[PDB]
Point group: D2
Chain length 384, copies 4
């Protein structure tokens, strides 16, 4: 299970670089130089890295220091072969963003968030990023009267339309991916799930420029089925990008390494991505626990890729098993793929076997044989 | 706080008629005649009632018994003035629906579910229903291999498109409202939240025929903010109908009476509905607890309407308070309503006060004054 | 992975016998004769079965029919070699128990619940049961004013003390195990977790007669760590019995087969039970999904035992691995087992290396190496 | 609703002093001088304040600076009349505590945590604290193999027994209160709920020295009923202290001001505390949201006390209402207070009206009238 750069594993600089500061604790690790992270991840078999603007260029850098950080970073990419498929904006750390960026109540803050983003898109294009991710981590509210959500949605649509106007203006070959999260650090966050983001995209001026970037642990913080959410995103044609990690149920955002958390969900996830032919990056947005030193940081990042590779092998064996293939026919997964009424509405209305002559009790008596199928999936996951 | 039929309070027959059977217990109350429920609700000040097909016509009724139940029901509506604004299909009780209706793996079951629905739409139109609700309570899965969600979404789209073809075919003035629920009785249910339903509607052939019917307790079973969800539905123009009840957090579907459960959320809900000018029915989908006898049934249903009326008074006082109106300006809710960049993209890029000359520290230092605003909302809710 | 009756797998009659009635659906399967369940489970490799009183003797049976059901049941046990290690009372199905049994507000109901229980203890002893389980499924409330919890706890203590007086009176060699559940079918249930039950036992007159019977899915309905709960029960000496199943997070009680649900938690559970030397029954309290016919019922029950056996093999390999044994020393699990201050309070106060001369920064810099250890546990679970 | 110091409202220095640093954001407010907080809280009507050791004496202070901070603090208490009823130890911020304090795997860290605590008890006694709170925020694990929970419980018992030996040794009139929390910042925390803490106390050498300090939002992070938990703590005699705040369901620890969050639960809480005659401090452990400036800080702290006072008035009116008093008799709350079988076991066994002659159907037919009672509680909460 050794990663190849064909496996397209990518990491956020903020992931292996997380210093371990949490709500009740100070940093446990020194800061990482972006250059060293690129080198270490390259040796581990990663394909690329991603960044917030403020991960790369310390907030408040003059043009001189900005260009110096960029050229050092770019040198590290040349020396390792690492790519930068995705970039994003930090619109949540600085106190100015305490009521949001695109949907702050203060108009001048909203303008500034648009400008800060625009400046990083230019940089993202220069480094070759294909996807620009937007996570509105501060767009929301702790109390009900603080945010008119219809107005806030007007301002959110407005920001994304202006960004699409810009990329169109500049001839940029780059697409946007909205990343949902239901809560934290705001008490409730706007566009809380994959569904809410998908719905919203359909109201934008140029919907084809916009997809979603779902995260395992985020949909799981609302107790939702992450493979189900991904399947609805693929069915709609909007899965531009994906963030992999683990999460143990409904609680604070854990950002465990991938495959930790809900293991059977990771299995069904990999199975879906592999079978659907998803070809984008396998991006890990995770936090090595603050118990770890740097050796634990790199072990945890290695574990992300290893667990994807093991599950991929297990899902491929599960779908290849002839006994599984017969189990699927036994549960009528083949019939689910067939049109309900390709013959049409009128034929349906005149088909007496569809109602008048339908033997409802015989139909109800057929078992679905789902428990045998699931044990085979278990047997395959465990290698039994 | 006495209900007027202008208040448009409506009840499901299955609500006050719930016999008290639960996963671990037998019925505590005898069955109610639909006629008696119409009479009792009319005396309480209700505007109308709603029904599943099987609430009204016992499953498996000949045409003779069917027409007899309908004419008795219709007589009760004539005698009381009660209306029937909404109707829906039972596609979840009978064992034949154990793997779903529109998305059962078995094709013959899917055909039968379409036919059973079509027969009830005709009836719904005859009784004057304006909205037809679809709750796919059995569309889902307990295990991962049992349902290909992309295929299932193909079958769901197919069913809803055929239904829209039918109403179009017949010149029916009726619209569909999809009711989301994240789980129970399936381990996970397809279209689990308002967002997932909104997204899906945009893929249908005739999206303008389809809206959502959100339920308080359903979005709250995923820990989501129900007023936030409703606001996104209004912003999209899709709030055709709404189901009111209470729920205490993430657990089984409680169906408590309205205003029980999360009280502050009910307040912010009423405030939104009243201020947005929502004009549809205020529908209660609730279950009088099985501890109650029939006198408790009617007290609980009365409590539904009373609590809506109290909160409506409190929200109206909150928005009318000049001190609240000044608090809202202090938190810049007025600025949230103003366009971020009505001047346009190019003006934004050349506006040096939006980035180069923006005093980020001064902006960050302004408090939002949200806690004063929320205490005024509290003071108003409590009548202090 | 074939079960031996030394593996002590036991099943509730109500488990494989569940007819599939749920809050929104009718039965999908016919009723099972207790005799046939004993035969079928014996062929599958089960060691024994358990029962509620009403599983075995239909509610309201004359003494004549009661003794006839008992003798038929007893004949089935003689013919198969099956044992009955545990029995319990149904104090939740009948409408009379709608406000609870031991803590009903009505005094006459509380008396009747005590008598119904006492009658089943006599029967349990005759059939050789060693543990009598109490699940107060209806002890609780949907609203706050309905139950004074201090009074209710007085009545609960009173019931359990009287039951202990009885078994003492009769010279019965049998112990009680309290089964916690946080909710459903009551909105909140009294003694909601393992901790609440453990605390309560310490207030009973004869605490040594009383332990806990935790259930996987129950502690998981509050989002708690089930292995952590079991370890606190073992540490206190109170793990008399245990109920195994699966559950996918915080939602209605799923009763999935064991190993479904949170798989990594099942692994850590088995590891704890095997290493601690737990010698009681491995009892499955589960529900074959109502999608299944009887062949699926027996496949699901087989899956319960298979998954226990696979995990047991994997946990045994994990603890036997020398590389794991060195990883555990690297994370200082050996030091956690050593007394903090066997030298005593005064030595601690005068030990300058414990405060005055303690190098806090050197200590903080040691990584815990937990992520390497967890990946080895993963590698072992998956058989990589 | 103006607070009197007889109302015994107390605040943690870390509460109004929280700078607004969260997992994804930097501080929004400057640090507060403990002296200014004492002055500002005194003007607001607070009775006292509480502290961690590191709130008062910056970590790593020489004896000279330590005594200087203490004397400045003590001067502020003399000038305002403020008391210090409770103190506690910071065993979670410093990186050395990243695997816990009392249950760190490293033995030298455990010794150091005991010594750091002991030093603050001496200080707590000098300032007149009556309760010493222990919150084991870092005692736990993110992965299963990292902590043997039985060993960890041995080390936890050991630490608390040594602390009790110390206070006994020194003749100190002070008692310990254990504060449970189910998660965050560890993935799971040991002693996760009130029940788990109560159970554990019963294993300590001197249980009478130890009670619990429950927090609203903590029990609510496991979806549990906080008034139910408090009632079990009062029934056991262990409610030494209490922490008040608000929390919106199962998610990260919000620390909203009291009365925000689950409002009806705050009502039932106040009702319980007032009726049970709880005489300890009403302590607010809350965080003014980081959206606020200092004026919002003080408004939020004022809101804590106001909302307690409003609810207290409403609960007192609810219990004083003759119509409520008759409703309680109608739901048989009076019978719940009466012994089930004061007549004894043998009388119970020979009482034919308790089983043989019991009319089970008549009993089951009595409604509980809980919904009328709850609407009166609602009517009273809202002032209708
Ligand atoms: Mg995250
Ligand atoms: Mg992310
Ligand atoms: Mg419902
Ligand atoms: Mg509904
Ligand atoms: Mg269960
Ligand atoms: Mg059980
Ligand atoms: Mg807290
Ligand atoms: Mg606290």
């Amino acid at each position: 299970y050794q990663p190849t750069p064909e496996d397209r594993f990518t990491f956020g600089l903020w992931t292996v670089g997380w210093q371990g500061r949490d709500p009740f604790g100070d940093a446990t690790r020194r800061a990482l130089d972006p250059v060293e992270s690129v080198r270490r991840l390259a040796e581990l078999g990663a394909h690329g890295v991603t960044f917030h603007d403020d991960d790369l260029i310390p907030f408040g850098s003059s043009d001189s220091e900005r260009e110096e950080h960029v050229k050092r970073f770019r040198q590290a990419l040349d020396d390792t072969g690492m790519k930068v498929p995705m970039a994003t904006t930090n619109l949540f750390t600085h106190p100015v963003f305490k009521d949001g960026g695109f949907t702050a109540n203060d108009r001048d803050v909203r303008r500034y968030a648009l400008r800060k983003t625009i400046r990083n898109i230019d940089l993202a294009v220069e480094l070759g990023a294909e996807t620009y991710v937007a996570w509105g981590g501060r767009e929301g509210a702790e109390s009900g009267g603080a945010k008119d959500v219809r107005d806030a949605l007007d301002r959110m649509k407005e920001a994304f339309d202006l960004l699409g106007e810009y990329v169109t203006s500049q001839g940029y070959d780059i697409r946007f991916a909205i990343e949902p999260k239901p809560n934290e650090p705001r008490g409730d966050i706007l566009l809380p799930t994959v569904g809410h983001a998908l719905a919203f995209i359909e109201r934008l001026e140029r919907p084809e420029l916009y997809g979603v970037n779902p995260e395992v642990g985020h949909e799981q913080m609302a107790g939702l089925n992450f493979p189900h959410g991904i399947a609805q995103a693929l069915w709609a044609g909007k899965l531009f990008h994906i963030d992999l990690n683990g999460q143990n149920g409904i609680k604070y955002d854990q950002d465990l390494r991938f495959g930790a958390g809900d293991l059977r969900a990771a299995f069904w996830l990999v199975d879906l991505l592999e079978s659907a032919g998803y070809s984008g990056p396998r991006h890990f947005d995770f936090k090595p626990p603050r118990t770890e030193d740097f050796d634990g940081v790199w072990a945890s990042a290695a574990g992300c890729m290893r667990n994807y590779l093991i599950l991929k092998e297990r899902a491929a064996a599960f779908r290849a098993d002839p006994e599984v293939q017969e189990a699927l026919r036994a549960s009528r997964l083949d019939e689910l793929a067939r049109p309900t009424a390709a013959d049409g509405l009128q034929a349906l209305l005149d088909d007496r076997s569809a109602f008048e002559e339908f033997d409802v009790d015989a139909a109800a008596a057929r078992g679905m044989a789902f428990e045998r199928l699931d044990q085979l999936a278990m047997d395959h996951l465990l290698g039994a």
